[PDB]
Amino acid sequence: SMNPPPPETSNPNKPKRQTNQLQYLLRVVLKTLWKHQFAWPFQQPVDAVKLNLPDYYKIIKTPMDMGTIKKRLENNYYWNAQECIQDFNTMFTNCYIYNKPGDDIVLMAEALEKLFLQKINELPTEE
Ligand SMILES: O=c1cc(N2CCNCC2)oc2c(-c3ccccc3)cccc12
């Protein structure tokens, strides 16, 4: 059993910016979810080998995790806020796609997503 390579966190061929919205996504949104009691499973890529989930990367073709998002934000990898917001949503959706409703991992994702939605509701207007 093998894990795929993780998502890229640097790409000199990809245009990127610092924006006040992206700064908010790191300082407020990522920071808030990262410190949460249920953050730990989402702080790095899913290790499908160690977790004995050999079908994981057959079902999940767009893996994403907050470790990757954190690195991307710190590196200023993104062009806009929507790209980063999409990464968070991909992470949550992967969990709901792979697992059953009410599973502990799904409950954890739901708690993080609730806070995510609350914080992005107050995403500042672009300066
Ligand atoms: O979709 C998942 C599906 C699963 N599993 C399916 C249910 N049993 C635990 C692993 O785990 C996940 C984990 C995880 C990582 C380390 C320990 C525990 C969980 C993290 C993120 C997503 C999943």
Side-chain angles (χ1 to χ4, degrees):
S1 302
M2 289 188 297
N3 293 307
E8 67 178 25
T9 58
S10 288
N11 187 346
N13 294 324
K14 180 185 179 298
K16 60 198 207 163
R17 307 188 291 181
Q18 294 180 330
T19 78
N20 67 308
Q21 289 183 334
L22 282 161
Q23 285 175 331
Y24 177 92
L25 279 159
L26 178 55
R27 175 60 174 86
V28 174
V29 183
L30 187 282
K31 194 179 199 186
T32 293
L33 270 64
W34 193 268
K35 71 190 188 185
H36 196 277
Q37 67 177 353
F38 296 158
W40 63 266
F42 304 96
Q43 287 176 338
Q44 59 287 309
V46 172
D47 187 343
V49 178
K50 202 176 289 305
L51 294 170
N52 190 32
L53 305 177
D55 71 333
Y56 184 83
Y57 289 111
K58 280 278 176 289
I59 296 164
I60 300 305
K61 299 305 199 185
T62 308
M64 188 49 56
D65 64 280
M66 297 203 294
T68 297
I69 294 170
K70 186 171 184 285
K71 287 173 185 177
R72 286 179 172 190
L73 286 166
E74 289 166 348
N75 292 344
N76 307 126
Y77 170 88
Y78 298 109
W79 185 258
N80 63 36
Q82 288 313 143
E83 288 180 358
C84 178
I85 287 169
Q86 182 52 240
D87 283 345
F88 278 104
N89 279 319
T90 295
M91 183 184 76
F92 300 131
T93 297
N94 288 348
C95 190
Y96 309 143
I97 288 172
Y98 183 74
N99 302 285
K100 309 184 195 184
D103 286 346
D104 275 1
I105 194 64
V106 172
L107 294 175
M108 294 171 95
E110 286 172 340
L112 296 173
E113 188 182 17
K114 186 180 175 176
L115 285 170
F116 173 74
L117 289 163
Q118 175 183 122
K119 301 302 182 192
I120 68 183
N121 182 53
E122 305 191 47
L123 186 74
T125 305
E126 179 152 39
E127 290 170 0

PDB file of all heavy atoms in Angstrom, residues 26-43:
ATOM      1  N   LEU A  26      -5.601  33.247   6.751  1.00  0.00           N
ATOM      2  CA  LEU A  26      -4.548  32.671   7.590  1.00  0.00           C
ATOM      3  C   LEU A  26      -4.703  33.059   9.063  1.00  0.00           C
ATOM      4  O   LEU A  26      -4.755  32.192   9.938  1.00  0.00           O
ATOM      5  CB  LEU A  26      -3.163  33.093   7.084  1.00  0.00           C
ATOM      6  CG  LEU A  26      -1.960  32.594   7.895  1.00  0.00           C
ATOM      7  CD1 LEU A  26      -1.973  31.078   8.038  1.00  0.00           C
ATOM      8  CD2 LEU A  26      -0.659  33.062   7.261  1.00  0.00           C
ATOM      9  N   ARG A  27      -4.781  34.363   9.322  1.00  0.00           N
ATOM     10  CA  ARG A  27      -4.777  34.901  10.687  1.00  0.00           C
ATOM     11  C   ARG A  27      -6.052  34.606  11.477  1.00  0.00           C
ATOM     12  O   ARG A  27      -6.002  34.459  12.701  1.00  0.00           O
ATOM     13  CB  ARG A  27      -4.541  36.413  10.650  1.00  0.00           C
ATOM     14  CG  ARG A  27      -4.629  37.095  12.007  1.00  0.00           C
ATOM     15  CD  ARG A  27      -3.599  36.553  12.986  1.00  0.00           C
ATOM     16  NE  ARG A  27      -3.582  37.301  14.241  1.00  0.00           N
ATOM     17  CZ  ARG A  27      -4.386  37.056  15.270  1.00  0.00           C
ATOM     18  NH1 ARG A  27      -5.279  36.078  15.200  1.00  0.00           N
ATOM     19  NH2 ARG A  27      -4.300  37.788  16.372  1.00  0.00           N
ATOM     20  N   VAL A  28      -7.189  34.532  10.786  1.00  0.00           N
ATOM     21  CA  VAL A  28      -8.480  34.270  11.434  1.00  0.00           C
ATOM     22  C   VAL A  28      -8.993  32.857  11.142  1.00  0.00           C
ATOM     23  O   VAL A  28      -9.199  32.075  12.069  1.00  0.00           O
ATOM     24  CB  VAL A  28      -9.538  35.323  11.039  1.00  0.00           C
ATOM     25  CG1 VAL A  28     -10.900  34.954  11.606  1.00  0.00           C
ATOM     26  CG2 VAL A  28      -9.118  36.699  11.534  1.00  0.00           C
ATOM     27  N   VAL A  29      -9.178  32.517   9.868  1.00  0.00           N
ATOM     28  CA  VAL A  29      -9.860  31.264   9.516  1.00  0.00           C
ATOM     29  C   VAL A  29      -9.011  30.032   9.836  1.00  0.00           C
ATOM     30  O   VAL A  29      -9.431  29.177  10.622  1.00  0.00           O
ATOM     31  CB  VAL A  29     -10.316  31.245   8.043  1.00  0.00           C
ATOM     32  CG1 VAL A  29     -11.074  29.962   7.738  1.00  0.00           C
ATOM     33  CG2 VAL A  29     -11.186  32.459   7.741  1.00  0.00           C
ATOM     34  N   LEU A  30      -7.820  29.945   9.247  1.00  0.00           N
ATOM     35  CA  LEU A  30      -6.924  28.810   9.498  1.00  0.00           C
ATOM     36  C   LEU A  30      -6.565  28.713  10.982  1.00  0.00           C
ATOM     37  O   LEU A  30      -6.648  27.638  11.573  1.00  0.00           O
ATOM     38  CB  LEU A  30      -5.656  28.915   8.638  1.00  0.00           C
ATOM     39  CG  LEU A  30      -4.659  27.742   8.622  1.00  0.00           C
ATOM     40  CD1 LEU A  30      -3.780  27.710   9.865  1.00  0.00           C
ATOM     41  CD2 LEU A  30      -5.367  26.409   8.428  1.00  0.00           C
ATOM     42  N   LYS A  31      -6.192  29.841  11.585  1.00  0.00           N
ATOM     43  CA  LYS A  31      -5.818  29.875  13.004  1.00  0.00           C
ATOM     44  C   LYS A  31      -6.930  29.318  13.899  1.00  0.00           C
ATOM     45  O   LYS A  31      -6.665  28.549  14.826  1.00  0.00           O
ATOM     46  CB  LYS A  31      -5.475  31.307  13.432  1.00  0.00           C
ATOM     47  CG  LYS A  31      -4.766  31.410  14.775  1.00  0.00           C
ATOM     48  CD  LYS A  31      -4.447  32.856  15.124  1.00  0.00           C
ATOM     49  CE  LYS A  31      -3.364  32.953  16.186  1.00  0.00           C
ATOM     50  NZ  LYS A  31      -3.139  34.352  16.644  1.00  0.00           N
ATOM     51  N   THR A  32      -8.168  29.699  13.606  1.00  0.00           N
ATOM     52  CA  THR A  32      -9.322  29.255  14.383  1.00  0.00           C
ATOM     53  C   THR A  32      -9.538  27.745  14.281  1.00  0.00           C
ATOM     54  O   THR A  32      -9.723  27.075  15.295  1.00  0.00           O
ATOM     55  CB  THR A  32     -10.602  29.992  13.941  1.00  0.00           C
ATOM     56  OG1 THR A  32     -10.493  31.378  14.285  1.00  0.00           O
ATOM     57  CG2 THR A  32     -11.836  29.402  14.612  1.00  0.00           C
ATOM     58  N   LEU A  33      -9.511  27.211  13.063  1.00  0.00           N
ATOM     59  CA  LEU A  33      -9.723  25.777  12.868  1.00  0.00           C
ATOM     60  C   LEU A  33      -8.544  24.958  13.390  1.00  0.00           C
ATOM     61  O   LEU A  33      -8.741  23.887  13.955  1.00  0.00           O
ATOM     62  CB  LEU A  33     -10.002  25.445  11.395  1.00  0.00           C
ATOM     63  CG  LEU A  33     -11.480  25.485  10.988  1.00  0.00           C
ATOM     64  CD1 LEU A  33     -12.051  26.890  11.120  1.00  0.00           C
ATOM     65  CD2 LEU A  33     -11.665  24.960   9.573  1.00  0.00           C
ATOM     66  N   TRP A  34      -7.328  25.470  13.211  1.00  0.00           N
ATOM     67  CA  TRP A  34      -6.110  24.750  13.598  1.00  0.00           C
ATOM     68  C   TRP A  34      -6.029  24.442  15.071  1.00  0.00           C
ATOM     69  O   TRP A  34      -5.556  23.374  15.452  1.00  0.00           O
ATOM     70  CB  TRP A  34      -4.881  25.544  13.170  1.00  0.00           C
ATOM     71  CG  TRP A  34      -3.595  24.760  13.232  1.00  0.00           C
ATOM     72  CD1 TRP A  34      -2.698  24.677  14.293  1.00  0.00           C
ATOM     73  CD2 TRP A  34      -3.018  23.924  12.178  1.00  0.00           C
ATOM     74  NE1 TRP A  34      -1.637  23.867  13.974  1.00  0.00           N
ATOM     75  CE2 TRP A  34      -1.769  23.381  12.721  1.00  0.00           C
ATOM     76  CE3 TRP A  34      -3.398  23.578  10.889  1.00  0.00           C
ATOM     77  CZ2 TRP A  34      -0.954  22.537  11.981  1.00  0.00           C
ATOM     78  CZ3 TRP A  34      -2.568  22.725  10.157  1.00  0.00           C
ATOM     79  CH2 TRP A  34      -1.376  22.219  10.690  1.00  0.00           C
ATOM     80  N   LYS A  35      -6.492  25.369  15.909  1.00  0.00           N
ATOM     81  CA  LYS A  35      -6.420  25.214  17.368  1.00  0.00           C
ATOM     82  C   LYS A  35      -7.586  24.413  17.960  1.00  0.00           C
ATOM     83  O   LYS A  35      -7.574  24.085  19.145  1.00  0.00           O
ATOM     84  CB  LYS A  35      -6.348  26.588  18.042  1.00  0.00           C
ATOM     85  CG  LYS A  35      -7.642  27.383  17.991  1.00  0.00           C
ATOM     86  CD  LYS A  35      -7.438  28.812  18.459  1.00  0.00           C
ATOM     87  CE  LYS A  35      -8.766  29.539  18.583  1.00  0.00           C
ATOM     88  NZ  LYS A  35      -8.593  30.978  18.919  1.00  0.00           N
ATOM     89  N   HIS A  36      -8.590  24.113  17.141  1.00  0.00           N
ATOM     90  CA  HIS A  36      -9.781  23.378  17.579  1.00  0.00           C
ATOM     91  C   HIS A  36      -9.431  21.991  18.055  1.00  0.00           C
ATOM     92  O   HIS A  36      -8.498  21.372  17.542  1.00  0.00           O
ATOM     93  CB  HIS A  36     -10.776  23.297  16.424  1.00  0.00           C
ATOM     94  CG  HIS A  36     -12.174  22.901  16.836  1.00  0.00           C
ATOM     95  ND1 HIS A  36     -12.539  21.622  17.020  1.00  0.00           N
ATOM     96  CD2 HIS A  36     -13.310  23.669  17.067  1.00  0.00           C
ATOM     97  CE1 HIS A  36     -13.836  21.571  17.368  1.00  0.00           C
ATOM     98  NE2 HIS A  36     -14.310  22.824  17.390  1.00  0.00           N
ATOM     99  N   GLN A  37     -10.182  21.487  19.032  1.00  0.00           N
ATOM    100  CA  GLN A  37      -9.948  20.143  19.584  1.00  0.00           C
ATOM    101  C   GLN A  37     -10.059  19.016  18.550  1.00  0.00           C
ATOM    102  O   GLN A  37      -9.462  17.957  18.727  1.00  0.00           O
ATOM    103  CB  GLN A  37     -10.910  19.860  20.744  1.00  0.00           C
ATOM    104  CG  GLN A  37     -12.376  19.748  20.338  1.00  0.00           C
ATOM    105  CD  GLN A  37     -13.298  19.407  21.494  1.00  0.00           C
ATOM    106  OE1 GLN A  37     -12.848  19.117  22.602  1.00  0.00           O
ATOM    107  NE2 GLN A  37     -14.602  19.434  21.234  1.00  0.00           N
ATOM    108  N   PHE A  38     -10.830  19.242  17.489  1.00  0.00           N
ATOM    109  CA  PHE A  38     -11.029  18.247  16.435  1.00  0.00           C
ATOM    110  C   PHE A  38     -10.167  18.510  15.197  1.00  0.00           C
ATOM    111  O   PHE A  38     -10.386  17.893  14.153  1.00  0.00           O
ATOM    112  CB  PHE A  38     -12.505  18.204  16.005  1.00  0.00           C
ATOM    113  CG  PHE A  38     -13.468  17.751  17.079  1.00  0.00           C
ATOM    114  CD1 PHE A  38     -14.809  18.105  16.992  1.00  0.00           C
ATOM    115  CD2 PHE A  38     -13.067  16.932  18.135  1.00  0.00           C
ATOM    116  CE1 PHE A  38     -15.720  17.692  17.947  1.00  0.00           C
ATOM    117  CE2 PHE A  38     -13.979  16.520  19.096  1.00  0.00           C
ATOM    118  CZ  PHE A  38     -15.307  16.896  18.998  1.00  0.00           C
ATOM    119  N   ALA A  39      -9.190  19.408  15.301  1.00  0.00           N
ATOM    120  CA  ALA A  39      -8.348  19.758  14.156  1.00  0.00           C
ATOM    121  C   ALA A  39      -7.349  18.668  13.770  1.00  0.00           C
ATOM    122  O   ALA A  39      -7.018  18.523  12.595  1.00  0.00           O
ATOM    123  CB  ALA A  39      -7.604  21.056  14.432  1.00  0.00           C
ATOM    124  N   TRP A  40      -6.876  17.903  14.753  1.00  0.00           N
ATOM    125  CA  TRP A  40      -5.699  17.043  14.565  1.00  0.00           C
ATOM    126  C   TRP A  40      -5.744  16.068  13.397  1.00  0.00           C
ATOM    127  O   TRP A  40      -4.727  15.895  12.724  1.00  0.00           O
ATOM    128  CB  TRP A  40      -5.310  16.340  15.877  1.00  0.00           C
ATOM    129  CG  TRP A  40      -6.353  15.395  16.410  1.00  0.00           C
ATOM    130  CD1 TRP A  40      -7.346  15.660  17.349  1.00  0.00           C
ATOM    131  CD2 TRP A  40      -6.548  13.995  16.033  1.00  0.00           C
ATOM    132  NE1 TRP A  40      -8.120  14.550  17.569  1.00  0.00           N
ATOM    133  CE2 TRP A  40      -7.694  13.517  16.810  1.00  0.00           C
ATOM    134  CE3 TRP A  40      -5.915  13.123  15.160  1.00  0.00           C
ATOM    135  CZ2 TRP A  40      -8.159  12.218  16.704  1.00  0.00           C
ATOM    136  CZ3 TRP A  40      -6.397  11.818  15.058  1.00  0.00           C
ATOM    137  CH2 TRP A  40      -7.490  11.378  15.814  1.00  0.00           C
ATOM    138  N   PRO A  41      -6.906  15.438  13.104  1.00  0.00           N
ATOM    139  CA  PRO A  41      -6.879  14.541  11.937  1.00  0.00           C
ATOM    140  C   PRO A  41      -6.689  15.264  10.602  1.00  0.00           C
ATOM    141  O   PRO A  41      -6.288  14.644   9.619  1.00  0.00           O
ATOM    142  CB  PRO A  41      -8.264  13.870  11.969  1.00  0.00           C
ATOM    143  CG  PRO A  41      -8.834  14.177  13.312  1.00  0.00           C
ATOM    144  CD  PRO A  41      -8.259  15.510  13.675  1.00  0.00           C
ATOM    145  N   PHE A  42      -6.993  16.558  10.574  1.00  0.00           N
ATOM    146  CA  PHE A  42      -6.969  17.347   9.351  1.00  0.00           C
ATOM    147  C   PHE A  42      -5.726  18.227   9.228  1.00  0.00           C
ATOM    148  O   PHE A  42      -5.637  19.033   8.307  1.00  0.00           O
ATOM    149  CB  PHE A  42      -8.240  18.197   9.287  1.00  0.00           C
ATOM    150  CG  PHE A  42      -9.504  17.384   9.372  1.00  0.00           C
ATOM    151  CD1 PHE A  42     -10.164  17.213  10.584  1.00  0.00           C
ATOM    152  CD2 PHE A  42     -10.016  16.762   8.242  1.00  0.00           C
ATOM    153  CE1 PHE A  42     -11.320  16.449  10.658  1.00  0.00           C
ATOM    154  CE2 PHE A  42     -11.169  15.994   8.313  1.00  0.00           C
ATOM    155  CZ  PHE A  42     -11.821  15.839   9.523  1.00  0.00           C
ATOM    156  N   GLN A  43      -4.756  18.058  10.129  1.00  0.00           N
ATOM    157  CA  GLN A  43      -3.544  18.890  10.125  1.00  0.00           C
ATOM    158  C   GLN A  43      -2.444  18.380   9.190  1.00  0.00           C
ATOM    159  O   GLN A  43      -1.405  19.016   9.052  1.00  0.00           O
ATOM    160  CB  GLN A  43      -3.004  19.052  11.550  1.00  0.00           C
ATOM    161  CG  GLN A  43      -3.852  19.982  12.406  1.00  0.00           C
ATOM    162  CD  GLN A  43      -3.386  20.069  13.846  1.00  0.00           C
ATOM    163  OE1 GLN A  43      -2.708  19.176  14.347  1.00  0.00           O
ATOM    164  NE2 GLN A  43      -3.762  21.144  14.522  1.00  0.00           N
TER     165      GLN A  43
END
